[PDB]
Amino acid sequence: HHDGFQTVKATIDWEHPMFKLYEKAKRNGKWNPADIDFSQDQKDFASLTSEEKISALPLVAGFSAGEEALTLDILPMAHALARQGRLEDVLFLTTFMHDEAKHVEMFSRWQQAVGIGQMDLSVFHNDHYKRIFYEALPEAMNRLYADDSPEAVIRAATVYNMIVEGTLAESGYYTFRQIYKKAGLFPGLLQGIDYLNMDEGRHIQFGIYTIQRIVNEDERYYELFIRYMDELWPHVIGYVDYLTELGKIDYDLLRHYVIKQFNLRKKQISRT
Amino acid sequence: VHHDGFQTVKATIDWEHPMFKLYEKAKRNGKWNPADIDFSQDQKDFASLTSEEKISALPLVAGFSAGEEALTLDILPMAHALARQGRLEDVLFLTTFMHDEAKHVEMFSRWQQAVGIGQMDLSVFHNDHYKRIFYEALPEAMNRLYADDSPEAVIRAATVYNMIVEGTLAESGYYTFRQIYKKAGLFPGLLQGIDYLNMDEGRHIQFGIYTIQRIVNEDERYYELFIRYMDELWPHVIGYVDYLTELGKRQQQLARTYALEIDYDLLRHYVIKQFNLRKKQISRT
Ligand SMILES: CCCCCCCCCCCCCCCC(=O)O
Ligand SMILES: CCCCCCCCCCCCCCCC(=O)O
Ligand SMILES: [Fe+3]
Ligand SMILES: [Fe+3]
Ligand SMILES: [Mn+2]
Ligand SMILES: [Mn+2]
Ligand SMILES: [Mn+3]
Ligand SMILES: [Mn+3]
């Protein structure tokens, strides 16, 4: 049952950080994947040899599954914060969920346009990738339906926002730019990446806000965060190594960048 | 719970799915931002009103504000249950649905803040019938879906949420706002909001129609479940409407001041009409 309603007893908390982030999401989130012109991507793709075509698909396969998992798996976070009465968080999360839906749409439109919609790209998900996206991520978010304790929320935000978004996604945007932007290939896709990268800045800020406000309550939670981060690193790097190994471009630069993101996300949370 | 795979890796979005097409319309038609609405004239209007006229408008606003908030929170179980069923295109659309309702919450709250009543507790205008619908039956029907996503459960959730709350009460609220405040020329920023809300609502009701019908299409038995759940909530729909009416009939000074003949019998009949029209938008097959 509802005991009452915040915007009937009072108003929105206009100064709340997540209301501010919601306002910025509406302002900066107007893009529409249906407006991206993929015609040249299609031509670029067909101009590749079979072997070059294949080299492109692992990274797209990681992203398409990623965007789909994140669209589905943010719902428990929204439910748990809703149940906690965190109205402004929920408003923001409506823009978060809608962003990920557009991200799903973007990669699928690209697949459709370049002619691989009918191909099953699951073959490029190795065991490490499945451990994160098929298993650890949904386990950690679905937990929130029955256990919204500080520890559960931090673990959910660590896997979703600091690992998948803050570490793999950010590294994937950089990777696309280092490989295809220099080659002049897939300009529609890279336009998409630009929009996704901009959305991701807000998504990561929500993860930081969430984790830090729980840490501020008890610095014992800081240790949990670092522990959950380190528990996932071997699959992050197991996946990265798998991708790198297929690519054989400075692949060792890209691998540094993953490490640099991982440590950056740890340093964005304050012990105190 | 594991993911077994992902549609957009094995295949693509179903580009021709009705809910993907509704999703596309939502993105095209749903750009409006409540932060862009100018309420400065509304603030002047409200302050020019006497105390009796000031409170004349508030029962309706109280009903909407809680409605918007309830609907923002309570659509999340429907999105979960369709996501668990693998209905990706429905989920895409529901992201636009939930964002619309968030903007609806924001719109009414901005208006309350702007006119100077954000600090007033408007729960006093929720009678017993309203609470039966919005504080109880609605969250019960939606929350059920976390442990019972059966056709019977999904039909009941869509009925309460899309056909009763949206299709009957919200639609009749939009109409009432226009018959009264648009006629009198008051609260232009609010009415701009109401028109955006009304446009959004069309999609929300169409999702409800799609959902109920696709279930009825699998077994006609469910059509009579739909009708019975509609009739079960009617006494609360009309009990709330009568409450608003009785309030409206005893606070006549706004109508007098602004030269309006508020036909409350006409408004009642619009609500009855909406209830029966929503019933008729569902067929046995
Ligand atoms: C080859 C160098 C390794 C670079 C790392 C690339 C990882 C690919 C990204 C796949 C997961 C993307 C998750 C989506 C996040 C979101 O939608 O917010
Ligand atoms: C005086 C005549 C009464 C007419 C009926 C008035 C009904 C008031 C509406 C309040 C409930 C609105 C629910 C919001 C629904 C939504 O956000 O989709
Ligand atoms: Fe994201
Ligand atoms: Fe609605
Ligand atoms: Mn390994
Ligand atoms: Mn009664
Ligand atoms: Mn994304
Ligand atoms: Mn609404």
Residue numbers in the entry:
A (entry chain B): 3 to 250, 263 to 286
B (entry chain A): 2 to 286
Give the published text:
The heterodinuclear Mn/Fe cofactor is found in the R2 subunits of subclass Ic ribonucleotide reductases (denoted as R2c) as well as a related group of proteins known as R2-like ligand-binding oxidases (R2lox). Although the physiological function of R2lox proteins is not known, the cofactor catalyzes formation of a tyrosine–valine ether cross-link in the protein scaffold. The two metal ions are bound next to each other in octahedral geometry by two histidines and four glutamates, with the manganese ion occupying the N-terminal metal-binding site 1.
The V72A/L mutations were found to have little effect on the global structures of the reduced and oxidized resting states, but an ether cross-link was not formed in the oxidized state. In the wild-type, the hydroxyl group of Y162 is hydrogen-bonded to the carbonyl oxygen of V72 prior to cross-link formation, and this hydrogen bond is maintained in V72A/L-R2lox in the oxidized state. In the oxidized state, it appears that the bridging fatty acid ligand is slightly tilted towards residue 72 in V72A- and away from it in V72L-R2lox, although these slight differences are within the range of the coordinate error. The Y162-I72 cross-linked peptide was obtained by digestion of aerobically Mn/Fe-reconstituted V72I-R2lox, but only if the samples were processed in the dark, whereas the cross-link was not present in V72L-R2lox. The Mn/Fe cofactor can thus oxidize the tertiary carbon of a valine or isoleucine, but not that of a leucine, indicating that the carbon atom has to be in the correct relative position to the metal center to be oxidized. Moreover, only a tertiary beta-carbon of residue 72 is oxidized by R2lox, as the tertiary gamma-carbon of a leucine in position 72 is not.
